[PDB]
Structures are given as C-alpha cells and as structure tokens.
Amino acid sequence: APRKSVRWCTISPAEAAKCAKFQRNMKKVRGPSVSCIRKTSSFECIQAIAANKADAVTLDGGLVYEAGLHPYKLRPVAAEVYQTRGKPQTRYYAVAVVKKGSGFQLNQLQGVKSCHTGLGRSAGWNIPIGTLRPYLNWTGPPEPLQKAVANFFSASCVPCADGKQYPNLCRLCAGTEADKCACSSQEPYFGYSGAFKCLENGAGDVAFVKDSTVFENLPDEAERDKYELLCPDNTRKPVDAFKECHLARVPSHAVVARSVDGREDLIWKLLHRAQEEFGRNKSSAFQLFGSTPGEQDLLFKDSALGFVRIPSQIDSGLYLGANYLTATQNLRETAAEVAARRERVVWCAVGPEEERKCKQWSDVSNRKVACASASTTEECIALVLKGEADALNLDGGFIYVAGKCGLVPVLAENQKSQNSNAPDCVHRPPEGYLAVAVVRKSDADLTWNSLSGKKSCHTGVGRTAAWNIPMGLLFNQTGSCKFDKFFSQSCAPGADPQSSLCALCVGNNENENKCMPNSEERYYGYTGAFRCLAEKAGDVAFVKDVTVLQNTDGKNSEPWAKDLKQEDFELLCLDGTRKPVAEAESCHLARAPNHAVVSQSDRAQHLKKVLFLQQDQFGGNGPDCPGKFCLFKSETKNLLFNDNTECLAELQGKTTYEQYLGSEYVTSITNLRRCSSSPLLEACAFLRA
Numbered sequence: 001a002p003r004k005s006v007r008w009c010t011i012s013p014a015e016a017a018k019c020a021k022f023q024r025n026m027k028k029v030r031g032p033s034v035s036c037i038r039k040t041s042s043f044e045c046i047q048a049i050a051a052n053k054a055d056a057v058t059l060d061g062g063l064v065y066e067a068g069l070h071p072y073k074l075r076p077v078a079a080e081v082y083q084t085r086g087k088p089q090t091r092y093y094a095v096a097v098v099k100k101g102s103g104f105q106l107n108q109l110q111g112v113k114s115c116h117t118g119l120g121r122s123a124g125w126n127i128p129i130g131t132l133r134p135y136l137n138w139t140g141p142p143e144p145l146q147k148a149v150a151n152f153f154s155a156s157c158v159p160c161a162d163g164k165q166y167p168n169l170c171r172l173c174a175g176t177e178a179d180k181c182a183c184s185s186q187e188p189y190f191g192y193s194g195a196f197k198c199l200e201n202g203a204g205d206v207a208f209v210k211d212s213t214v215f216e217n218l219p220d221e222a223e224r225d226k227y228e229l230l231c232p233d234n235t236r237k238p239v240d241a242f243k244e245c246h247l248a249r250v251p252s253h254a255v256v257a258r259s260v261d262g263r264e265d266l267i268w269k270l271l272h273r274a275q276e277e278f279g280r281n282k283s284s285a286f287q288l289f290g291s292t293p294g295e296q297d298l299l300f301k302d303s304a305l306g307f308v309r310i311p312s313q314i315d316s317g318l319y320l321g322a323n324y325l326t327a328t329q330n331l332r333e334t335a336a337e338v339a340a341r342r343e344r345v346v347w348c349a350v351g352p353e354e355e356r357k358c359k360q361w362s363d364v365s366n367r368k369v370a371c372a373s374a375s376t377t378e379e380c381i382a383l384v385l386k387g388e389a390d391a392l393n394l395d396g397g398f399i400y401v402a403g404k405c406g407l408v409p410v411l412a413e414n415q416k417s418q419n420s421n422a423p424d425c426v427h428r429p430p431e432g433y434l435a436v437a438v439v440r441k442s443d444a445d446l447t448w449n450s451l452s453g454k455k456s457c458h459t460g461v462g463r464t465a466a467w468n469i470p471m472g473l474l475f476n477q478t479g480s481c482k483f484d485k486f487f488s489q490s491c492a493p494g495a496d497p498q499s500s501l502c503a504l505c506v507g508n509n510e511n512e513n514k515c516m517p518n519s520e521e522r523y524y525g526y527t528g529a530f531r532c533l534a535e536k537a538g539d540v541a542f543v544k545d546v547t548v549l550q551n552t553d554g555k556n557s558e559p560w561a562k563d564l565k566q567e568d569f570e571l572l573c574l575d576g577t578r579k580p581v582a583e584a585e586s587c588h589l590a591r592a593p594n595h596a597v598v599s600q601s602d603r604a605q606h607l608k609k610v611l612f613l614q615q616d617q618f619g620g621n622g623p624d625c626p627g628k629f630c631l632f633k634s635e636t637k638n639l640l641f642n643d644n645t646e647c648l649a650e651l652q653g654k655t656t657y658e659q660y661l662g663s664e665y666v667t668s669i670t671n672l673r674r675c676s677s678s679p680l681l682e683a684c685a686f687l688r689a
C-alpha cells in the first residue's frame with residue numbers, strides 16, 4: 001500500500017540547506033516526504049537521477065535538453081510558471097543587459113567582457129551564443145565551441161566552463177580558491193542574479209540573463225534606468241521593453257524525472273502539496289519560491305508562481321519545441337549541415353512501404369527532399385513538431401490534430417478532376433470527396449438502419465471518410481460513447497489491439513502487426529477497408545465513392561481484386577434507401593475535405609515552392625512521371641498521396657485548419673472528442689497553452 005519518498009538532488013550547501021528546510025516543513029505539514037541527495041552540479045544530478053541515485057531536479061530549458069539525450073533519457077514532469085504581469089507563462093524571454101553609456105550594439109560584442117549565467121543554459125549560453133555564431137568565425141565541432149567564445153570575449157564568467165583549457169571563460173568569475181567558476185551557487189556569479197551582479201559590480205559589460213532578473217534586483221525605477229537591453233536589431237531599448245528587445249523566448253525550467261519508473265506520480269503530489277502549502281504567500285513558516293540573499297534560485301526560481309503538470313507523451317524534444325531544438329542542435333552541427341537542412345524538405349513517411357517510396361523520391365530529386373519515418377501518423381506529426389520532419393499529406397481528420405498543435409495546411413490534394421483539365425488543377429477550387437457506406441448487393445437485408453451488431457471495416461480511427469463521419473452520425477443516433485459495442489466486430493487500424501475494433505484486422509502477410517494504423521495492415525486505408533469488404537471479413541465498409549470504382553471491374557488486378565465488379569456493390573443512403581455505387585452523389589454520408597499537406601507556418605512558403613517544382617517534374621503531368629517517378633502513383637496502395645491525385649493545389653484562402661475543414665466538421669469532431677481524446681491532442685493542449 002505505502003509509497004516511498006521523492007529524492008531531490010541538490011547542487012550546493014546552500015541548496016541542501018534549503019532542501020532540508022523543505023523536508024522539515026513538509027513533514028511538519030504531515031504531507032508527502034522528501035529526501036535530499038547532494039551532488040555538485042545540475043549536470044551531475046542528471047546523471048544521478050538516471051542511475052536511480054536520485055529522482056528529481058529542476059533544470060533550465062538548456063539542460064532539459066541534455067538530460068533527454070540518450071544515455072540519460074529523462075523527461076520533464078512539471079514546468080515552472082512565471083508572471084511578469086501578464087498571464088503567468090511557461091515561457092520567458094532571454095535578454096542581454098548592459099549599462100547605459102557603454103555604446104556597444106549587439107553586433108559589436110567582439111572584445112567585450114561578458115557575464116553568463118552558466119554553460120548550457122538557455123539565456124546565459126545557448127541563445128546568445130547561437131545569436132553570435134556568425135561573428136565567432138568558428139570552424140564547427142572539431143573545434144570546441146568553448147574555444148571560440150573564449151577568443152571572442154576579452155574575458156567572461158561562464159560557470160561550468162573548463163577554466164583550465166579555457167581560463168578566459170572563467171576569468172571574470174569571483175570565487176575562492178576552487179570555488180571560482182563553480183557550477184553551483186558557490187560561484188557568486190552563477191545564475192540569473194549572479195550574472196547580473198557580475199554586470200553591476202563592473203566585472204563584465206554585458207549580462208546575458210532572464211527578462212525579470214533586472215526588476216528582481218533593482219526594485220526601483222530610478223536604478224533600472226541605469227541599464228538597457230541590446231536588441232537583435234542593433235539598437236538599445238529600456239529594460240522594460242524585453243517584449244520587443246529579446247534575443248529569444250524559451251520554455252520555462254522544469255522538473256525532470258526518469259523516463260521509466262520515475263515516479264512521476266510521487267513527484268507531482270509532492271509539488272502540488274508544496275505550492276498549496278508554501279507557494280506564494282500561502283505560508284510564513286516556509287516559502288518554497290524564496291531563497292537567501294547571498295545565493296538566489298535555490299531548488300526553484302525565486303518568485304515562480306508554481307507548477308503545471310506536463311502531460312505523459314511529452315518528452316524533452318516536444319517540450320522544447322522546434323524553434324529551440326533547432327538552435328540548440330545547431331550549435332553542435334557544421335554551417336554546411338545547418339544550411340543544408342534549411343534548404344531541403346524532410347517528408348515524414350508513415351510505415352515501411354511509404355519510406356520505400358519516399359526514398360525513391362529522395363534519390364530522384366537529387367535530395368532536395370529527404371525522408372523521416374514513423375509507425376504512425378501521430379508520431380509523424382510529433383516529428384514535425386520537434387522539427388525533425390517538415391511535412392506530410394494528411395486526412396481531414398488529422399488536419400484537425402495538426403491544426404490543434406499549430407500546424408497549418410500548405411497545399412491541398414486535387415483528385416483527378418472533371419470540368420476541364422481547364423486551369424491546371426493548381427488553381428482549381430478543391431472540391432472534396434464523398435464519404436460513403438458500402439455493402440454487397442448480395443446482403444440486401446442490410447440497411448443503414450440495420451448496422452447495429454453487424455461487422456464493420458474502417459479506413460482507420462481518426463480519419464474522415466471512415467471513423468469521424470460514420471461514428472459522428474451514429475453517436476447522434478445512439479448517444480453512446482461505447483464505440484466498441486455498436487458494431488459486433490470490426491477492423492479499424494489504430495484502436496486498442498484487444499478491442500472488438502481490431503477483431504477483423506489482418507496485419508501483414510505473415511499476420512504480424514495486426515491493426516497497426518499504416519500500410520503494413522493489409523485491411524488499412526480506403527483500399528484496405530474496401531478489401532475487408534470484398535474478402536467478406538466485414539459486412540459494411542466506410543470509404544469514399546471512388547475507392548470502389550478503382551478496385552472493381554479489373555482496374556486493380558491484385559488477386560482479391562481482379563474479379564470484382566461495380567455491379568457487386570451498392571451504397572447505404574441515410575434514408576434507409578440503397579443506390580448503385582454510381583448514385584453516390586445522391587447517397588452519401590458526407591462531403592469531406594480533400595487531404596492536405598501541412599507544415600509549421602514558418603516552413604510553409606519554402607515547402608510550397610519545393611512542392612510546386614517536384615510535382616511539375618513528377619506530378620500528374622510529370623515529364624519524368626512514367627519515365628522515372630510519379631509522385632502520385634503507387635500501385636493502388638495510395639502511398640504518400642492518393643493514387644488519383646492530379647496535383648497539389650492552392651487553399652483558396654482557407655489557410656487555417658478551421659477555415660479549411662470548415663465550421664461543421666470542426667464542430668462534429670469536437671463533439672466526438674467528448675467521448676474520446678488522443679494523447680497527441682492533449683500534449684498539444686498544454687504546449688499551445
């Protein structure tokens with residue numbers, strides 16, 4: 001029954017002491033028990049924690065990074081909240097503070113004395129240094145970054161730097177014999193306030209710190225007027241203009257724990273009791289977010305409002321975000337490597353068969369396009385959020401998720417026509433596609449109104465034509481969230497492998513990966529769903545009108561296909577009627593949005609350009625299409641894009657997910673969330689929070 005104690009890892013005597021006071025008062029409140037382990041630097045706790053020597057540590061965005069690096073695989077459990085009179089935030093602006101009358105501008109720091117909060121930290125290192133890389137005139141990795149900064153600045157105080165091989169980096173540092181340049185509050189110039197003092201005491205000419213830090217140390221407008229901020233546009237603005245004069249906006253610091261068996265639950269209860277009991281002004285016996293004057297930010301940043309729990313799937317990469325991840329990864333890559341990724345486009349292939357085709361695409365495009373792969377479509381979207389991939393073609397249903405996580409639709413899939421190949425198709429208004437409900441002419445017993453208890457074949461969960469649209473209309477008729485009980489058995493790749501929704505699914509050829517939501521599951525997709533019907537594994541199939549047409553009458557000559565006929569299948573109309581597959585325009589469940597490519601709003605324009613070219617070269621009218629590669633063909637497996645795609649068109653102004661999917665559907669998708677939500681959906685709720 002009993003659950004043990006959270007072992008918090010401290011980095012210096014001052015920190016231990018605070019921790020002890022923390023344990024003391026916690027037990028006195030008769031709440032969750034704490035324990036204080038002592039190592040000598042945040043870097044060390046990271047190691048301690050992963051080896052089960054400890055359990056938790058607060059870390060600045062920068063260290064969360066390394067903490068998440070392979071050998072350690074730690075993850076952010078709770079993010080600190082800060083308020084500098086707005087909405088408390090889980091982000092903060094990194095700034096560069098200087099005294100007035102110093103003259104520099106951000107592009108003239110060469111030879112200046114500088115004070116950093118510590119090696120590896122967001123505001124104090126990762127961000128300023130990435131901003132000044134263009135002036136370091138640095139080779140890249142072979143050559144230690146520490147070596148450049150050292151030649152760049154006349155002297156500095158960068159706690160945690162090799163004061164041995166690079167003394168220039170530790171030189172301004174005040175500290176006793178070996179306390180000098182310490183990676184703890186032993187070095188008086190460590191941290192936001194440390195770096196600030198190093199500035200006010202006249203040891204350095206520029207302090208690289210947090211937005212609040214000036215206001216924290218100088219409570220009077222008169223004294224702050226003695227200082228300014230260096231804006232990235234080579235001008236200087238007052239200290240309360242950080243909102244305009246910032247080098248960057250990073251994610252708050254965070255409590256990290258092990259990825260496996262980290263006791264996230266223990267840690268959260270502890271912190272929830274702590275805010276409640278010692279948060280801002282709650283108590284007087286102990287203040288969690290306050291420290292001694294000699295040393296600031298002990299255990300947590302002084303004056304933080306409290307914490308917010310970080311959902312489960314979120315790891316350090318997603319927590320930090322693409323913006324941050326790129327700039328940090330970019331301090332460990334060559335100039336050529338950076339510029340190279342910035343000009344290519346990384347597509348995210350979902351599943352083995354897609355990466356194959358993508359690889360063909362890459363080779364054939366002299367690598368203007370590279371690939372990235374995941375087992376699922378959610379994973380791809382995450383990759384895109386971490387910044388490891390640049391885009392992918394998504395179904396309306398997932399354009400919703402992508403949209404809720406901030407991605408925007410770039411171009412849309414225009415199916416092969418019909419009015420005139422008139423324009424090209426690039427300016428044709430996307431006209432969407434009809435979602436239908438298919439069954440065999442044979443079972444004539446069967447009517448929409450009789451699906452109850454019958455077998456179902458879905459393209460996959462989360463998708464428009466299948467799931468979203470039929471389940472949307474059924475939930476309306478039964479008011480029941482138990483989606484796994486309407487149809488007797490079903491195959492819907494993506495569901496709980498032990499639920500009836502995965503009953504009819506078949507996996508690859510050697511019957512492995514049953515129900516997985518990607519090509520490897522043979523009964524996956526429009527094509528897969530329809531087949532689940534033809535092979536009589538299911539009684540009704542949810543797909544689009546065209547899917548039948550493309551696999552009957554011998555068009556698809558795969559064994560199970562070959563013999564089928566437009567004639568063998570009819571659709572179930574909402575009014576209990578039944579029409580031939582051809583009368584779909586008068587017998588559909590809904591009008592869906594064509595699929596669409598999505599990317600971060602940043603990459604959109606470049607993405608477009610590269611795609612207009614790539615499809616002009618291998619598109620539906622691609623000169624080298626039959627010849628060397630057709631981007632829109634894949635042997636009816638609908639890899640990367642639909643096989644009937646003519647071209648990727650313009651959005652006609654519908655540039656946001658809401659605008660693109662449209663009112664209705666967006667709302668319908670939300671009513672369905674009432675029943676079930678996705679972990680990705682939640683992770684994004686927090687990040688976009």
Ligand SMILES: OC[C@H]1O[C@H](O)[C@H](O)[C@@H](O)[C@@H]1O
Nearest residue numbers: 430431432591593594660662
């Ligand atoms: O009426 C259906 C329409 O739905 C959405 O607006 C799609 O973006 C569009 O392509 C489609 O024509």
Ligand SMILES: [Fe+3]
Nearest residue numbers: 060121122123
């Ligand atoms: Fe920081």
Ligand SMILES: [Fe+3]
Nearest residue numbers: 395463464465
């Ligand atoms: Fe779809």
